[PDB]
Design a protein around this nucleic acid. Structure first.
Ligand SMILES: Nc1ncnc2c1ncn2[C@@H]1O[C@H](COP(=O)(O)CP(=O)(O)OP(=O)(O)O)[C@@H](O)[C@H]1O
Ligand SMILES: [Mg+2]
Ligand SMILES: [Mg+2]
Length: 857
DNA sequence: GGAATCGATATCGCCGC
RNA sequence: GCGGCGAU
DNA sequence: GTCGATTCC
């Protein structure tokens, strides 16, 4: 019984009587009457959102795992753990055989029990009918039992062995299986590890009821959450004492849930250009919803305020400029999806084209997930395709844009430009230009990108387009009769285009064409680093330097690795049988340690190509180094290998993947040395600044833990402040939640590298939005972090504006150093030496960028 | 110092138990 | 919180 | 299960 918010609350955002004459005037009565009734819906779609989710929270008893009920259990668990702590001193300070519950409740951490009760309590209390203290008490015990039993595993026996457990534990969902897991763990733990009995088999259902009853007692004692009243006293088959939730506390919830359901808005797009950003907040949507948009998406309220008075117009315009872009539904494209999705889970998934256990149960696991997604993935489809259907007859729709704490612009709504193929393919720009002989040279280029040809020179890409002109046309003539679009690396977009490419043919270059051609960078990551350090080797790689042949970072590190293989294939170490005794069993074993010489043999035997290197290198920007590739190598190619038929050669999977790692790791830390250096330098910087330098002779705080802060080239300032709570409260099979804060130096030193590049690309895009807006009449953009698009016509320009906006930023500054000046005077006296120097620069000439056909942006 | 522990892919979003 | 999805 | 790097004895 939740306080329906859908009253005077949402009523707030009045779509007919509010100071909205501002919009009316500016766009009209209808659109301004629309924008507000929409926004209003968003919330109405937000409340509903909350209810149905809250419905199944009660309907499974998980009403404790709901933010609506978590504020009570915060003042409710201190009262209850204290009373059980006095009660343990009440019978300990009194001779005579100790109560039935007290023998057991002396095994499970009291705090735990304390909670265990609260939860399963409210859970059964929200059941259909059965609330009797009989079944109730039975439940509580049932559970507490489990925790003293399997919590001993996590306490002494698997002190470290638990590592191998935790993992498969969390992965296990639902009370049942989690138990299924812990019993089988127990049966093998005493079968090898620590020995003893199982003094829980003596725990009769009686013992269980006993526990579950003395607790509840403690519960109505310490608190009044539940009043223990008699149900029809004076009857033999009706007089049963039962539990009821204190009407007061029930209101707390119904109320907390009420106000909650009103801050989860379903952000739609706008009917009228968004409300420019004046600062910090109030931006994007127009109404004054009980959920304003922040300029920046941040975690802590204070962190957002640090912006309030900051100056940065370069930035405020970017958002605003970019946010003004008008788009429209691709009415043609949509009636294609409107057909094929109603005849297929995935319009483009299947179209008629021309180690025993640990493996059989390996693929079995597959077949499970692969169907999880196929159903989650359609859950998102059904959404888009709906949104899309709402706004198909609208003349033009707009998207508000925030930023993440590090810069990056995002749209606000759910259905947005930064979608997936299908998504992006329903979205084309509202104002067009006529195309022109140069505007169409780019339609076509795009068309080449959308079909997968993009690592071959632009004429080529055009060759392609032209060789298949008939096809394309086919598709655009009749889309449903031809699946050639579909099979294309980006179908729904690539078919976006085919309807344009046939508009050209029917109207010659005078064709008004609003479709977003987009210029994607190579690996923004390495790029920036390689520029901010003039690394010609590296830039070459991401195509910072112009070339005739599209350079492919993966393909080249592939290379550098095949070169090491063959070098070990001839020299290198030989095998080696080393003895490995198990940590749990103490059993002796024989394991031959494949040597470089052979490992390679295999590698070579398998067939190393771009595809064995991609992921590792493409994530190299987020941190992964030598260690993290193993896992990747192994599962991204070694496993699916064996599990595919090939893989024979993979005698020691782990060893083959331990090795390939290092190879990769050596082959990239020489191709993008830049990225390597810049990242590590940065990583140092943050470590230091994270540290809590003291004197271990006073154990005195010399310079507390410093966060990290810098300012992007376009005026944006980023604040890397990762906080870790000092709490804790792990539970086994039920929950295990909440119980001040401090900077978590690890998170801190981790997230610098990525974040920094990530705020940087940030600046860069915000600038090209501006630059190419002011300097060239371009007023219509497609923004995807590292992907800029515009209409066929302004296209020619964009392409250059970027290669421009870029070289400007790297020429004019050295964020690396600038970044120094930022913390420099914050490094305590003592650490002034552990801070390595800014790596030397290179011989790259940024100005080359301006002529790199392939480093689009 | 030396032996004992955490940790290893970044930010945004949606959905779900 | 874990799971999955999707965006770079 | 390698590499190491930071913590407490
Ligand atoms: N290990 C990883 N973890 C998370 N996201 C990853 C990832 N590896 C790749 N991705 C994402 O997956 C996407 C891969 O798309 P692809 O089309 O395979 C890459 P690409 O950069 O166009 O090169 P390609 O043409 O060689 O495929 C990237 O957009 C990236 O953001
Ligand atoms: Mg690609
Ligand atoms: Mg990526």
């Amino acid at each position: 019984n939740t306080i329906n918010i859908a009253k005077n609350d949402f009523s707030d955002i009045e779509l007919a009587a509010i100071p909205f004459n501002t919009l009316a005037d500016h766009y009209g009565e209808r659109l301004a009457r629309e924008q507000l009734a929409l926004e209003h819906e968003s919330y109405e779609m937000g409340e509903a959102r909350f209810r149905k989710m809250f419905e199944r929270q009660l309907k499974a008893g998980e009403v404790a795992d709901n933010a609506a009920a978590k504020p009570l259990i915060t003042t409710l668990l201190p009262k209850m753990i204290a009373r059980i702590n006095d009660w343990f001193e009440e019978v300990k300070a009194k001779r005579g055989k100790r109560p039935t519950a007290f023998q057991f409740l002396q095994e499970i951490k009291p705090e735990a029990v304390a909670y265990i009760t609260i939860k399963t309590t409210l859970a059964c209390l929200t059941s259909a009918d059965n609330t009797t203290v009989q079944a109730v008490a039975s439940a509580i015990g049932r559970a507490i039992e489990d925790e003293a039993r399997f919590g001993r595993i996590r306490d002494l026996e698997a002190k470290h062995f638990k590592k191998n457990v935790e993992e498969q534990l969390n992965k296990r969902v639902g009370h049942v299986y989690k138990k299924a897991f812990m019993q089988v763990v127990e049966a093998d733990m005493l079968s090898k590890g620590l020995l003893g009995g199982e003094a829980w088999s003596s725990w009769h259902k009686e013992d269980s009821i006993h526990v579950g009853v003395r607790c509840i007692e403690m519960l109505i004692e310490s608190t009044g959450m539940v009043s223990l009243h008699r149900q029809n006293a004076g009857v033999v088959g009706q007089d049963s004492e039962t539990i009821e939730l204190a009407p007061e506390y029930a209101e707390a919830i119904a109320t907390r849930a009420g106000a909650l359901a009103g801050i989860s808005p379903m952000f739609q797009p706008c009917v009228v250009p968004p409300k420019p950003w004046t600062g910090i907040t109030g931006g994007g949507y127009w109404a004054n919803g009980r959920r304003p948009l922040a300029l920046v998406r941040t975690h802590s309220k204070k962190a957002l305020m640090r912006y309030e008075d900051v100056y940065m117009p370069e930035v405020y315009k970017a958002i605003n400029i970019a946010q003004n872009t008008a788009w429209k539904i691709n009415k043609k494209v949509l009636a294609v999806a409107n057909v094929i999705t109603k005849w297929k889970h995935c319009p483009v998934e299947d179209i008629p084209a021309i180690e025993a256990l640990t493996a059989w149960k390996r693929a079995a696991a597959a077949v499970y997930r692969k169907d999880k997604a196929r159903k989650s993935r359609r859950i998102s489809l059904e959404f888009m395709l709906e949104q899309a259907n709402k706004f198909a007859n609208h003349k033009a729709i707009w998207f508000p844009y925030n930023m993440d704490w590090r810069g990056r612009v995002y749209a606000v709504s759910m259905f947005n430009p930064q979608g997936n193929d299908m998504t992006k393919g329903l979205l084309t720009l509202a104002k067009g230009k006529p195309i022109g002989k140069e505007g169409y040279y780019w339609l076509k280029i795009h068309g080449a990108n959308c079909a997968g040809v993009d690592k071959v020179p632009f004429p080529e890409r055009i060759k392609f387009i032209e060789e298949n002109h008939e096809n394309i046309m086919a598709c655009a003539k009749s889309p449903l009769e031809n699946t050639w679009w579909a099979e294309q690396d980006s179908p729904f977009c690539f078919l976006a285009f085919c309807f344009e490419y046939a508009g050209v043919q029917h109207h010659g270059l005078s064709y008004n064409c609003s479709l977003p051609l987009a210029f994607d960078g190579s690996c923004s990551g390495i790029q920036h680093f390689s520029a901010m350090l003039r690394d010609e080797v590296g830039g070459r790689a991401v195509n910072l330097l112009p070339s005739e042949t599209v350079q492919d970072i993966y393909g080249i590190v592939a290379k550098k690795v095949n070169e090491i293989l063959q070098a070990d294939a001839i020299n290198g170490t030989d095998n080696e049988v080393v003895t490995v005794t198990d940590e749990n069993t103490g059993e002796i074993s024989e394991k031959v340690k494949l040597g470089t010489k052979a490992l390679a043999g295999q590698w070579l035997a398998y067939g190393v190509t771009r595809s064995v290197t991609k992921r590792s290198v493409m994530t190299l920007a987020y941190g992964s180094k030598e260690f993290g590739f193993r896992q990747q190598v192994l599962e991204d190619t070694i496993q699916p290998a064996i599990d595919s038929g090939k893989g024979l050669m993979f005698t020691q999977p782990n060893q083959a993947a331990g090795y390939m790692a290092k190879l990769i790791w050596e082959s990239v830390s020489v191709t993008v040395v830049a990225a390597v250096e810049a990242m590590n330098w940065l990583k140092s910087a943050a470590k230091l600044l994270a540290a809590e330098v003291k004197d271990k002779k006073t154990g005195e705080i010399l310079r507390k833990r410093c966060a990290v802060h810098w300012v992007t080239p376009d005026g944006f300032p980023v604040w890397q402040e990762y906080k870790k709570p000092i709490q804790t409260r792990l539970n086994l099979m039920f929950l295990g939640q909440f119980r001040d804060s401090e900077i978590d130096a690890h998170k801190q030193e981790s997230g610098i590298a990525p974040n920094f590049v990530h705020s940087q690309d940030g600046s860069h895009l915000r600038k090209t939005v501006v630059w190419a807006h002011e300097k060239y009449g371009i007023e219509s953009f497609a923004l995807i972090h590292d992907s800029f698009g515009t209409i066929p016509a302004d296209a020619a320009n964009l392409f250059k504006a970027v290669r421009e906006t870029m070289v400007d930023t790297y020429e004019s500054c050295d964020v690396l150093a600038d970044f120094y000046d930022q913390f420099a005077d914050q490094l305590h006296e003592s650490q002034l030496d552990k801070m390595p120097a800014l790596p030397a620069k290179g011989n790259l000439n940024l100005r080359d960028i301006l002529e790199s056909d392939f480093a689009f942006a």
